[PDB]
Amino acid sequence: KTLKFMTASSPLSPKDPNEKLILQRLEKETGVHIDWTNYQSDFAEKRNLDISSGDLPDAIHNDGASDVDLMNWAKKGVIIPVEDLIDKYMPNLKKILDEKPEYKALMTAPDGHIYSFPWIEELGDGKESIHSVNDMAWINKDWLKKLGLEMPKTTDDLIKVLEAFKNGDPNGNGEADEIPFSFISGNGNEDFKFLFAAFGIGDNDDHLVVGNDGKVDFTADNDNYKEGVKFIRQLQEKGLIDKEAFEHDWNSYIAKGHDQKFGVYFTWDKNNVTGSNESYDVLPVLAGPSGQKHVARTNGMGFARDKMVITSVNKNLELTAKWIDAQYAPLQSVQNNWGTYGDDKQQNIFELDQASNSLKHLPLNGTAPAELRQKTEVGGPLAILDSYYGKVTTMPDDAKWRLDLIKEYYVPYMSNVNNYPRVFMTQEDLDKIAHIEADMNDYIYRKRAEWIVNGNIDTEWDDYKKELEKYGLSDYLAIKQKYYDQYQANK
Amino acid sequence: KTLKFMTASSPLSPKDPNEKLILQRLEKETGVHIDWTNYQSDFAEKRNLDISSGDLPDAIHNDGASDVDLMNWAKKGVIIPVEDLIDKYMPNLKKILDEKPEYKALMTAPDGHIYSFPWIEELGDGKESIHSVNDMAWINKDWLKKLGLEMPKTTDDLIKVLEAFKNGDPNGNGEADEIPFSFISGNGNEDFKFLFAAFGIGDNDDHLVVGNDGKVDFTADNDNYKEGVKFIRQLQEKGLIDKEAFEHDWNSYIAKGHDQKFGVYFTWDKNNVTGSNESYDVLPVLAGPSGQKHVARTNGMGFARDKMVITSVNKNLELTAKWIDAQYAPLQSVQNNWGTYGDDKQQNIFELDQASNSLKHLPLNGTAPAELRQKTEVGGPLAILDSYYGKVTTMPDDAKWRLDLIKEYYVPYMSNVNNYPRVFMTQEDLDKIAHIEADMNDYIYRKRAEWIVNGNIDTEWDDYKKELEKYGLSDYLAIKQKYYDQYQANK
């Protein structure tokens, strides 16, 4: 009858998730009422507080936990193994894992157990994966045209173009309101790290790529990365960087984007920032000063190990497992991921075709894709397989488009045969890595920021590398190299 | 004979705590060898990692956990109550708690147990507490004298003075190397929030004061606070602020301070930043534009609830309790807190007068006090009572000095009769407060930095306050108000 789930949702979505049409239909379909503890900001901290305080729900929905957390909770008995529950009570999920046993391998821990229910979304594979590049660079072609400038081909062209943006008044309003270059610094889709590949090798949110000699390379200690920092520093020194880039947030970023104040900026999809217009387009991959022309691959993929865990206080394992398996029904997975049909007081992502019992995406008509999706999606455990497109649902227009942009612009320069595989380390190695990352992760971005605002990377670089080593960088690399080699060896 | 303790220490101190002279003597005296897990950066993250993974020591030394963490560990049985241990095995601590019963109340959770062993240090009381002000403002008096300027007495004087620092080349090298105004943004001793009181009410690291009407006031939604942000924004607009003030760190901060580049800066004690010299002095309390002249009280005090917890895996509670009780011996408490004597090669904070069997502070002769302290102190649970001064130990000279500065400059303008008492809330209230602070704490500083670097506080202020309310601010204050009323109803 009733289950208590903790969940994570967008602050744009309703405070009570049961107000969402998907979940209203679901309750009428399953006969299960969910009482939600719905965290719309700082989910992970508030979740951890719940776990540390012993105030556990029946399950944690849309969880997104790290492997070290996943394993610590399992060893402590906070969550339970679920492989028997899958085999007994979950025919939708069992069909997917049995059809595609590699996903089943991705879910299994070193101890042979499965502890969580994944998100699977098949959009491209290998270099052509939609996740291959997250922080795409976009440029205002309209300003290029007004200033009579060609699309820049080199990093030196980019500097000249940004100077024209800063001083040439391309909007025509007689004010220096143009922001030549902007980003949200850190991890994620709005960072500038995409341009570091123009100096060779590049960078990603893991700071980790895989060389064609099969060696894992920590990127944030490469000379090429030092050179990428000096280039951004050059833009800062020339007054080309958004004066707010190191303090502003998403809301401010898109407000300037909507007003079309950006010359060059970074995001996943321009339609979320500068909108549905032809004024902005992909910045083509640039050659560096020595002719480097490269795109570093992320280690992202259409798979997330944990979008649901079941706690040890859960009162009705069979009911819970069956509820979760309804989320892996194809029509349900598609909707939970992307939105739904037939709302009367809200725009709809889908229309339902009753004749074929299938979903068809509707045109967004200017609405930001991320905005409507986060209002109406549900998140959580689900699977979208390649065989579903054209049968269960259409492929989203924005997904089709981005896949093609990655093919056209980036794949020709993704010269690393491999990226880092999604491995599931032992608790012992997870713990060691977690201790190291507790020092390293913030430190890297802090130093990066300080070097762009000041300009002392030349005198601080070697000390920085020694700090990383003290934090345990070469043990870090050894562990990652170890799992890479194991992954290759058993392929 | 052997116990495993986790501890936190300065990165200036030896990696193995047993290299410290205090602990080498402690081992001879107690016959107990401690095997240390010593974290010198990110102690709390790495401690939490150890707890989450079940890698528990016998005890956590110098722990400093928040109340919510304490009660959560207690409820889940990570740590044990210790009141029976105190009664059965700890005559020094028992002697302290009976001569000073208010600390016993401060150690006791609402469920009637004691869960940790405190740090106690008596240096002033009430408004004269050495903790009443943490981020004191300091000003280069040499520059005032070279420029023929009077000490500023208003916020409008301060701007004029800072402008004279920026342009007037008061260090006389013909270059604009003077940094008029600098700080390390956030909580703690180097932040600038001390100046917000010149606009009435002011601010502290809790963003919480207590009005003379007995009502708790959240400071960061007051118009006074908005005016304080607008003042710092004016200094940013006039190019008066350190260009890396929101990027740099303590080491960079004190490197610039050692070079005497600062006009006005913030720290606990100038001897740690600009050194032991008369070039710098207290910045007197400033009158604001409307005549506001105020010092906001912090809620700090000479008491920390948890500098040691005992874990549920601890094998030898009697041995542990007696070892902890040795730390509460008066001569041992003083040394664990402040440093030691008799090191024939290294500098010493103390000499041991063996006739009187008491400690006397030594002149450091240029050495910053905090630097020798963090190399040779031990931390952990300890008590220094006011009755010890003149009997067990000298009062530190830099402490007497800071205390005199607080009386002379700040106490006349600390017009709040109360600050917020150190209450021990229920676990249910602790956990509710911690959910709200997960949202508010970072938000408050992020918006403040943003507003100083852009200039849009006036158009974002109301949305900012609605956001604070969405995060639960009124619930936050009602809880804080309940405990304050309950406190006053009991004294």
Ligand SMILES: OC[C@H]1O[C@@](CO)(OC[C@@]2(O[C@H]3O[C@H](CO)[C@@H](O)[C@H](O)[C@H]3O)O[C@H](CO)[C@@H](O)[C@@H]2O)[C@@H](O)[C@@H]1O
């Ligand atoms: O390019 C569209 C295509 O990309 C995918 C990749 O999985 O969506 C990811 C994308 O969505 C994420 O962010 C939104 C908004 O926060 C969130 O609602 C969603 O759950 C996320 O997966 O990220 C951008 C911007 O964040 C969104 O525009 C986009 O939906 C894929 O699902 C989609 O078809």
Ligand SMILES: OC[C@H]1O[C@@](CO)(OC[C@@]2(O[C@H]3O[C@H](CO)[C@@H](O)[C@H](O)[C@H]3O)O[C@H](CO)[C@@H](O)[C@@H]2O)[C@@H](O)[C@@H]1O
């Ligand atoms: O003013 C001297 C007087 O202040 C006290 C207050 O408790 O010390 C606080 C003070 O110590 C802290 O910081 C040092 C160095 O990081 C650390 O070793 C120590 O354990 C901390 O309590 O903080 C400043 C610097 O922040 C130090 O100069 C000073 O020691 C008191 O103990 C001392 O007598």
Ligand SMILES: [Ca+2]
């Ligand atoms: Ca313009």
Ligand SMILES: [Ca+2]
């Ligand atoms: Ca490297």
Ligand SMILES: [Ca+2]
């Ligand atoms: Ca000068």
Ligand SMILES: [Ca+2]
């Ligand atoms: Ca208020």
